[PDB]
Structure formats: C-alpha cells, structure tokens
Design an enzyme around this catalytic site. Sequence first.
Site, short mmCIF file in Angstrom:
data_model
loop_
_atom_site.label_atom_id
_atom_site.label_comp_id
_atom_site.label_asym_id
_atom_site.label_seq_id
_atom_site.Cartn_x
_atom_site.Cartn_y
_atom_site.Cartn_z
CG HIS B 43 -2.24 5.97 -120.60
ND1 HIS B 43 -1.20 6.23 -121.82
CD2 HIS B 43 -2.74 7.40 -120.08
CE1 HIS B 43 -1.05 7.80 -120.91
NE2 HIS B 43 -1.36 8.15 -120.06
CG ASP B 99 -0.17 4.04 -123.09
OD1 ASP B 99 -1.34 3.82 -123.22
OD2 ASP B 99 0.41 5.48 -123.03
CB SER B 197 -1.57 11.85 -121.32
OG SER B 197 -0.72 11.00 -120.30
#
Lengths: 9, 249, 28
Positions: B43, B99, B197
């Site tokens: 992502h 992910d 992230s």
Amino acid sequence: DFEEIPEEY
Amino acid sequence: IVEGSDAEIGMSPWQVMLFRKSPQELLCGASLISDRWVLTAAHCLLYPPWDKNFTENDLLVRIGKHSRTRYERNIEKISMLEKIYIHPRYNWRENLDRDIALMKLKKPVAFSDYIHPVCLPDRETAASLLQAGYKGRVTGWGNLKEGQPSVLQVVNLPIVERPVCKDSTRIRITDNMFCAGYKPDEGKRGDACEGDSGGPFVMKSPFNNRWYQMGIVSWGEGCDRDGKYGFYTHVFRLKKWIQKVIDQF
Amino acid sequence: EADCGLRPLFEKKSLEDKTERELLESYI
Ligand code: NA
Ligand code: NA
C-alpha cells in the site's frame, strides 16, 4: 522540512 | 510511532526510509533484507482509492538514517530503485490482505555500523515467536500522534490473540495478518501511525540472538486508540512469494 | 544473509540496547 539532498541522487 | 522513544544509534540498522523525490517527503518505512533488496508494504506503493501508484523513478530509498529530516552526510546512503515487485494477490480493494512489496536496488549498498540487513523468519522461528503476549519492536519516522519526530522512534508491543484482533474491528482479518498492542487495561500504550507504514515489526530470537522481521506495518484505524490494535503483514506466511521473487530476480 | 540480524553496534560488540530485555522477558 526535509534538508536538501545532494543533486547527484 | 505513538508513545515510543528515540532510537539508539545503530539500534535498527535495517531501517529504510522510502522518500518521495518531488516533492521531497517521507512516504513510508521499509527494511533492508540484503545488500540489494528492500521489503515494504504494497500500500506504500499502490493504493488506488487514494490515487497512489508510484513507479521506480518516483522514489529513493534512504538507508542508515537516524534523523528524519536531515541529510546525514557520511552515514546514510541513498539508493535508486531498479524494480518494484508487488504481491500479485495484494488486496487493496478490501482489507489489504498480502500487503507486501519488494524493491530491487540499482546497486548494492555497502554495509556499515549503521546499515545492516535483518533476518527473515524460517518456519521454526515463526512458530516459536508468533505467540500472544510475546513482544516485538516497531520503528519509524511517522506521526507521534493521530507532530513529526526529529529522529527515528521505537516502541515495543505485544502480539495479540487472534479473537481479540478480530473482535476489535469490522474489517475481515486474514491468516496473512497479525495484530499487536496493549489492551485498554494493560496500562502501557503505543502504536504505529501515518508514515510508519511499510516499516518492520522485529523480534530477537532467544535461540540464536538474531533479529528477525516477523511483520510489516500495514494498517490500523486511527493511532493508539483504546481497544484498537495495529495490523501487520505476516512475513513468514508470504515467504514463498518473497523467495520466488528473489530467486527469479 | 549469513550475518543477518546481528547489529554492528550491539550484538557484534556484545552490547545490549536499553529495551531488548523487555522482549526477552516476554518470551515465556
Ligand atoms: Na470483528
Ligand atoms: Na490501541
């Protein structure tokens, strides 16, 4: 905010 | 990172900063797994709901860093990407299942006191270490709350039991995820936040005293909210894909 | 990586960081 990175990159 | 502390120098020598070339800014965290391969969250690179779709030439990886904003002359190294590899079954449409992404560097980075790869788990280390209550460590230059830190932040967080993870959210959780963080009544706090992230969740094996990356910072609803937990990509479960890419590329 | 996961400024010098023992203590 970010300091200047060497032009070569 | 929320309710973390400043890292020590060289405490996370596998930490990578994904850096937007124009405008220059932090994009995400990432990790070094060899002298030419970098691990991150899919992502960070591809998220159509937010019109995010980066190509190689959009980005730099900065390795060896401590300060968030400063150019760390004679210490960090800055690398260009040769190729991005996103998991073919990454589910951006629904819950971010799988992910995970690899980035191949144009040239090998030289290891140093500040630059060194993390290990990826074998089945036996994953079985031993991925247990409720066992703590890992998350690191990153993301938000301190739901400003931005001067230096890399670190927080240690316990893995949570799968039913607690599932009952904390309306999102469908999969076997390719795990969650971590303190429960409302455990006292202590801490979480990943925006900017963190793609960075690593690591654990130190007590059997061989090496650090292993068990998770990738993937998603959370808010940051450090009571009764919510951060979700991490389960790196061992996706190791076949990682191996196949490194083997084939 | 043969030498992966061993940090030059810590494991390679037998120096511990300030919170790694929180992790070891949780591996019960
Ligand atoms: Na639920
Ligand atoms: Na929480």
